[PDB]
Amino acid sequence: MKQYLELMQKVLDEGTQKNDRTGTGTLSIFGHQMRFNLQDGFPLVTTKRCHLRSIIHELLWFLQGDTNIAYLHENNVTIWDEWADENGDLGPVYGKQWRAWPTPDGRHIDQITTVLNQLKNDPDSRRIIVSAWNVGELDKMALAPCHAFFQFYVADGKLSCQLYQRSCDVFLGLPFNIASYALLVHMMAQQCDLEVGDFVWTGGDTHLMSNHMDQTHLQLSREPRPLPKLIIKRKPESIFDYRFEDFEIEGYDPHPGIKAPVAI
Amino acid sequence: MKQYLELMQKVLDEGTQKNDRTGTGTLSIFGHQMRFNLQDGFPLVTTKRCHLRSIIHELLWFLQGDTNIAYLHENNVTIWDEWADENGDLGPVYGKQWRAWPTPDGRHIDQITTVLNQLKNDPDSRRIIVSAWNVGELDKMALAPCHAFFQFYVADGKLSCQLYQRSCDVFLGLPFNIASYALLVHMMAQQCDLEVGDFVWTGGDTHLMSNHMDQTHLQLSREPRPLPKLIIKRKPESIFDYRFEDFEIEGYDPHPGIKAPVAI
Numbered sequence A, B: 001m002k003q004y005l006e007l008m009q010k011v012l013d014e015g016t017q018k019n020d021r022t023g024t025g026t027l028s029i030f031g032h033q034m035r036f037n038l039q040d041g042f043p044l045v046t047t048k049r050c051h052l053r054s055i056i057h058e059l060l061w062f063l064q065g066d067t068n069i070a071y072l073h074e075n076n077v078t079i080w081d082e083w084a085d086e087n088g089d090l091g092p093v094y095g096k097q098w099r100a101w102p103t104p105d106g107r108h109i110d111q112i113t114t115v116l117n118q119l120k121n122d123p124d125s126r127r128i129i130v131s132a133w134n135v136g137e138l139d140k141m142a143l144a145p146c147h148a149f150f151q152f153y154v155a156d157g158k159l160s161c162q163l164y165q166r167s168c169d170v171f172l173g174l175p176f177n178i179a180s181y182a183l184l185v186h187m188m189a190q191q192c193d194l195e196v197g198d199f200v201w202t203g204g205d206t207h208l209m210s211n212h213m214d215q216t217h218l219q220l221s222r223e224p225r226p227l228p229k230l231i232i233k234r235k236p237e238s239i240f241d242y243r244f245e246d247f248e249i250e251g252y253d254p255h256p257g258i259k260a261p262v263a264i
């Protein structure tokens, strides 16, 4: 996508050399924002093939409040394996905070239901927020949430969403994060009887791994194809009742996949 | 300031009419980002006079973890009066969350010290964050934090900071929020022996009150003057040992003040 390739070029042109915790260098910029009109099409990167199957399953898993990879395994989704312990536990990561944020007084807050209530009963609210950044539980998480904080917004029958992503691997992480939040906006809009508006992506440390220079050059040579169209085949009675087969992507014609290897 | 006046014009040109909880209309946009190179000067709005005295005292009060207005009163700062109860209590707002975020296991997390540790011992960290968005304590706050979440970043001996502000009154609130965070970046840089980099402001619902049309037109007619220079007169031994008189602003020559009235 146009916005994505401009970010990619901007990191190459403007990134400063920064070490990360792996020891691999990165090229890094701090602070960037992009916007996707969801009425223009589903924002799935076309300049390299992205397997949507994993994105969907992960999102459904988040919404269940599940932090054990067992569900992902039933479906042969392995994207969380490197972080899981022998039991398949990740600690209180994303889904746990979305659905069951623990308070000092013994409650567990369902942030997803809260947001649905607000969208339905107080759509002009400037407080419609989900946070995964639970300071008291960070130590226990396999890793700190990258996509940390998001806000919904309703104007003119349109649902928009802004994500604050503290840390972003532009090559491996970003394509997947944008699709995942766009899908969530579509499910939220469906459940609230609203139209989709904008997805606004905001980045903190937004970086390319230094061993991804060739892959980045390769991708930047490719021309974006038209965006696909997301189809939702049914309206469940709840945001928690979606199933994998409810979603269809139409018109997706990507350039071939690019493998990007990682250091250990 | 240039960036500020462009935001102001952009809300007028692009804002949609949105009601708020007061009942006053707003003109609102969702998602905006601006950047201030702090080496170019202190970002205090010149196209209307801003009284820095209040900004400073409020910031020192935040850093104390104090949520009772008593300290502000000793100094005849009244900006929090409309929200305080008869005892002068605000509930567990900003300062309480910065200095003493309560965990379910009975701890209180000092996020300011945490950030200082990281800046000194692990400056490449992509997790150097302070959040005021404590989901379990929102109900008890006089109001939900507007400036909710911020991230620090170190590259090339320069300290940058990004603020996510969920809700922003462009006329009354914003000038004051930018100065307050720029001052914090200067104090943090001083304590960590770093140079100042960028302050990146990111907005959610960014709005002008509909009864501020005349004041906005007036201000937009004015030409920005050069930015002032911040002077810190001493280096305290701790981020908690700053005093009002440690700060001086040099070269500040603003156009006259503009009063903006509010509905009740």
Ligand SMILES: O=C1NC(=O)N([C@H]2C[C@H](O)[C@@H](COP(=O)(O)O)O2)C[C@H]1[N+](=O)[O-]
Pocket: A021, A143, A144, A145, A146, A147, A167, A168, A169, A170, A172, A173, A174, A177, B126, B127
């Ligand atoms: O969804 C995600 N998107 C991402 O881009 N990441 C990336 C950003 C970083 O390159 C890395 C996390 O490392 P730290 O930022 O050091 O925690 O993983 C994180 C990630 N995740 O852990 O789920």
Ligand SMILES: O=C1NC(=O)N([C@H]2C[C@H](O)[C@@H](COP(=O)(O)O)O2)C[C@H]1[N+](=O)[O-]
Pocket: A126, A127, B021, B143, B144, B145, B146, B147, B167, B168, B169, B170, B172, B173, B174, B177
């Ligand atoms: O620092 C601040 N900056 C701001 O711009 N505000 C503004 C944004 C809104 O116009 C209003 C808060 O109302 P809600 O967004 O409805 O909570 O107050 C909030 C504020 N504060 O409460 O400290």
